[PDB]
Amino acid sequence: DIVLTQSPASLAVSLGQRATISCRASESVDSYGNSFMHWYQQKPGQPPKLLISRASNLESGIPARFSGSGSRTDFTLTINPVEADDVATYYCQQSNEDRTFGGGTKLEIERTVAAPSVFIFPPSDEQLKSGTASVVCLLNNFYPREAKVQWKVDNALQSGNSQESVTEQDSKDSTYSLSSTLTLSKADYEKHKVYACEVTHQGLSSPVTKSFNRGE
Amino acid sequence: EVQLQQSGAELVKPGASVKLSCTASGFNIKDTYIHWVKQRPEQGLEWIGRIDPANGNTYSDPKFQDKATIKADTSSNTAYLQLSSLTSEDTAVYYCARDVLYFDVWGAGTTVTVSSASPSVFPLAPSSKSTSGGTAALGCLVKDYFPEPVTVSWNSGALTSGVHTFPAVLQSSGLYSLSSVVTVPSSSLGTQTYICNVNHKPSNTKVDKKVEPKSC
Amino acid sequence: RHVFIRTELSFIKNNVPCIRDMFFIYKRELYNICLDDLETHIYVQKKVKDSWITLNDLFKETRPHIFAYVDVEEIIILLCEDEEFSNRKKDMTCHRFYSNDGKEYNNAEITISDYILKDKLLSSYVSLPLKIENREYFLICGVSPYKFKDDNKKDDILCMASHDKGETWGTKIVIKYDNYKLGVQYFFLRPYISKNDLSFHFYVGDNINNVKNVNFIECTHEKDLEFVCSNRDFLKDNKVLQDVSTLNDEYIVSYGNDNNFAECYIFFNNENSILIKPTAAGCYGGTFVKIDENRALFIYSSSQGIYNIHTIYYANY
């Protein structure tokens, strides 16, 4: 069988730079003058979209910043210049002998450092009546992805009672967004008053705390 | 207009069998070959097999078991993937695609989730703590649901800008949970209403939670 | 009103291992163009008694494409060189063999300058002269190795023809046909000619497993040198289409039970059937060799050079 390996597993490029993704096949993928190597783009929550077919054929509707090159076992996808809505996983695929896909190449955009917009949510009264309490800290539109959110209840550091969530890099501003939820019991919630989340990021001069007192 | 509509998201108890539908629009499946690709969460693309609907000839990958039977009906213009006795290693997004010696038309995907069992929708109210003058945050918390396909929308498709639907986190309770924030100015809170339309097609749950601000 | 069917099985022993067999009937006798590579030879052989008798070796002094044409009193065999598909010459060089008997041939090298099939796939085959008006033509046809949804020219097949018994090939025969399938691979295009009617037998695939599906298109004159071709459906559930010939003005079609051809079915006008059940072997490679409008042979090779010959007589009134 024809095995496809992609290099690199992920790429970090800035807007306007050139990104080259390579695809190496265990056997020749050429047949009667055609190279059966095709490239797809997959954005999270959507199906793969055909970009280039038969090594270099740009598909109708695909921007000219996408191009493919390659001969027998070695092929390349070039995105030049890279734009913000190019953040996606890129796969190569052959149709010379059965159908096989490459591992994937994640394209991440590098941009200026942007500080997050920190917000805090008390647990809802409809949820408080059920017996559990979720306090939600929100980090809105920041770069880089690396951010540290510590939970502090009555100045005590919390550990083991929170879960994080990070969205895909926005297709317009290339920033990330984070969610931290302190899951406490209804009994432990009313035992304490001051609820704060301390966000530490590269874009921040010093850690920012956004607090609220319980009752509200 | 070329197209491939796939069946709705479905729950599937372990060991039971499922049949997905892939229906063409703009072309006849007889004049092409319909393929199936399996994509596990956070994984790559895995080719399953293909049906040649003109003769009924089918081929599934040897490594990929004969637990997938490809079928087709040209009078209805539909292809089927029958997955039998499914395990959690079969919880994946199943795509159908048209092959013209490359995959040029894709289906949106069917989320297949094996469900041992079975979404609590709580309101993440916009308070004065989550308010930066003319910037604000509000959302819904999709807590403790068993199959993973959950579909949060805002104002039935009217509100799309500023929307950050966070990926799901699998709680200690073994049930998924996710937030869904959105940035809006603090001028039109008492005038503009924000309803989240969470649909859980596997367990058949449709909730339409209204988001209302509160006194700090 | 009256239907006659007679079948007979006989064997032929070949002392030569043929990688490719090309059967033909000349002066009511069975012949074979045996390609032997172990050391390469292209033997002309003839059925005598229970054995294949090697008459000549056209590869005395030169794997080529073989286009053999059987006329009433002549055999014209062409051996054409083919280079790598993607590094082909603009002129084709062939070796033309001419015979009034089966044994002795005269070799003459010919050149087909700026030949129209440079981008086509050619296959070896036996054929008959096709009478167009008062001229008799020999046809060399090729097909696109692949058809894509965005093909610029949509006529996959093309023919170059000779009306001087194979010396010059300056006649172009347009073939109007586009495969139903949006993206397809083509194999072994072979023209079938019966009573001045043109047809094609070929295979279609999609680079999946090693699947090749037989297709048969019947063609009709649109102009003197133009034909409109279209698919002729011989599809049968749980039976794979294999060969097509015509007896009694009707189609005689062979099928295998599956892609491994353990046994074969022959259908006469899709009305009557016979079953060919092959020591333990299959009928892979089964081919019709028409004798007259009521007689034909069905040949496939078992073991090494054991040829199973099924003599079929069929009549319908």
Author numbering:
A (entry chain C): 21 to 236
B (entry chain B): 20 to 137, 141 to 238
C (entry chain A): 31 to 68, 74 to 97, 102 to 317, 323 to 361
Article excerpt on this structure:
We also crystallized CyRPA in complex with the Fab fragment of non-inhibitory Cy. In contrast, non-inhibitory antibody Cy.002 binds to a different face of CyRPA, contacting blades 3 and 4. Therefore, neither of the antibodies that bind to epitopes concealed in the RCR complex have neutralizing activity.
The leading vaccine candidates for a P. falciparum blood-stage malaria vaccine are members of a heterotrimeric complex containing reticulocyte-binding protein homolog 5 (RH5), cysteine-rich protective antigen (CyRPA), and RH5-interacting protein (RIPR), collectively called the “RCR complex”. The leading blood-stage malaria vaccine candidate, CyRPA, is essential for invasion of Plasmodium falciparum into human erythrocytes.
